[PDB]
């Protein structure tokens, strides 16, 4: 796997970004997380849902360097979003949501599962620490 960088254009919610990307503007999804939901009429404002916001976007707008690292399966998903590991100069911000009890590890989905161990190792941190969901 390698990074490649990207550029911030739009935080959406926890776990979807829009960064210009090889010149273009894409929608990029966080591989592995799922983190509450501030969309949907269907769901409403989930509770930490605009937490999970607050900290992606700050984590992103305040770096200095973005990269984009995408696993070895496919690299859209049926939406036309990027799917991706994002880093926020050198942090990886799936793993930073789930290390603070902002996200849970998603569903996998063989090939798409590199960081699989490390990501369910914050979690299980996180959830030793009661913090935030897992409070």
Do not use: C
């Not at 010149?23 to 983190?35: E, I, N, S, Y």
């Amino acid at each position: 796997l390698h990074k490649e960088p990207a550029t911030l254009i739009k935080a959406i919610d926890g776990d979807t970004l829009k960064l210009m990307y090889k010149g273009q503007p894409m929608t990029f999804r966080l591989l592995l997380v799922d983190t509450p939901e501030t969309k949907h009429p269907k769901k409403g404002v989930e509770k930490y849902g605009p937490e999970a916001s607050a900290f992606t976007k700050k984590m992103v707008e305040n770096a200095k360097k973005l990269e984009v690292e995408f696993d070895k399966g496919q690299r859209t998903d049926k939406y036309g979003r990027g799917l991706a590991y994002i880093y926020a100069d050198g942090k990886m911000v799936n793993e930073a949501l789930v290390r603070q009890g902002l996200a849970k590890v998603a569903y996998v989905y063989k090939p798409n599962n590199t960081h699989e161990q490390h990501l369910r190792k914050s979690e299980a941190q996180a959830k030793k620490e009661k913090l935030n969901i897992w409070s």
